[PDB]
């Protein structure tokens, strides 16, 4: 999951950078993907706590 998201459950594992994985996941819930890319540090630090 951390390296290929959900692709390995449907076929071959396809690598993608994790920061880009998180951005697709926000898109799936109707949030525009720049919200992560411009705030990557904030989301990662808040998640870690």
């Amino acid at each position: 999951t951390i390296t290929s998201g959900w692709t390995f459950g449907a076929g071959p594992a396809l690598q993608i950078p994790f920061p880009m994985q998180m951005a697709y996941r926000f898109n799936g819930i109707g949030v525009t993907q720049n919200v992560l890319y411009e705030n990557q540090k904030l989301i990662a630090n808040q998640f870690n706590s």
Binding site: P19, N34, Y37, E38, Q40
Partner: peptide, 22 residues
Amino acid sequence: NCDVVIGIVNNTVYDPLQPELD
């Protein structure tokens, strides 16, 4: 602006209107 995202690359973005229009 392209100074907050980490990992941006420099490339040309093609606008189809500009050449034909001008």
